[PDB]
């Protein structure tokens, strides 16, 4: 690893600088180096890791969708043949995206998840595992598409089970997990009723526990609750 000679603390410091500079590829590389030092990550450090890769893959997904749309139009009746270039370039972007997903899944498997014993860390990592299999699913068209989808489902489900047992219904990790698993149901698993049920129940159970929270915790929870409501509005 090119980051093998840099101090863990220096990698974290630089990830924070990269974030400030909106250099997310760099931020992700620094955080990969930090993980590979082999020590568990703090809450702040887990967030740096997730922010970095979310931004990187988020950009790849946006580009893939542009390119896939162009490709789709090229295959409509009456579209002039333009050769292999659109497919080739969509494939290039797709392969880079899959590579990023595999890198993140690799970090979670070696060895973030197995060393995470506290609910907050284990749920955080398992949510990521679900999310990155979901991104793989978005581009999957082959023999393994089912197994990729099931991999996402299984990770989300383990996260859900732990989060329900161990965290309050207003916990922002629990909320964000539910938000994303709900989207998995709607967009990946062809289960819109499940998506809607999940978002509604999650919202309502959080609403009921808001009274227990400080002003600051209330802000964090209500922000994610609004995202659940936004999805429900979109879907109904």
């Amino acid at each position: 690893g090119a980051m093998g000679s840099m101090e863990r603390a220096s990698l974290i410091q630089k990830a924070k600088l990269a974030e400030q500079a909106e250099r997310y590829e760099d931020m992700a590389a620094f955080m990969k180096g930090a993980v590979e030092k082999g020590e568990e990550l703090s809450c702040e450090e887990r967030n740096l890791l997730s922010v970095a890769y979310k931004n990187v893959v988020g950009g790849q997904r946006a580009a893939w969708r542009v390119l896939s749309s162009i490709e789709q139009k090229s295959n409509e009746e009456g579209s002039e043949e333009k050769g292999p270039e659109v497919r080739e370039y969509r494939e290039k972007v797709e392969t880079e995206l899959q590579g990023v997903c595999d890198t993140v899944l690799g970090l979670l498997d070696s060895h973030l998840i197995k060393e995470a014993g506290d609910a907050e860390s284990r749920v955080f990592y398992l949510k990521m595992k679900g999310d990155y299999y979901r991104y793989l699913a978005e581009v999957a068209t082959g023999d393994d598409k089912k197994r990729i989808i099931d991999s996402a489902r299984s990770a989300y489900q383990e996260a859900m089970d732990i989060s329900k047992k161990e965290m309050p219904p207003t916990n922002p990790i629990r909320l964000g997990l539910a938000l994303n698993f709900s989207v998995f149901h709607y967009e990946i698993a062809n289960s819109p009723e499940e998506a809607i049920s999940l978002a509604k129940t999650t919202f309502d159970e959080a609403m009921a526990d808001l009274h227990t929270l400080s002003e600051d915790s209330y802000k964090d929870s209500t922000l994610i609750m609004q995202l659940l409501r936004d999805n429900l509005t979109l879907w109904t």
């Binding site: 999310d131 938000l179 994303n180 994610i224 995202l227 879907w235």
Partner: peptide
């Protein structure tokens, strides 16, 4: 596209 975090 729906919201995720």
């Amino acid at each position: 596209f729906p919201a995720t975090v």
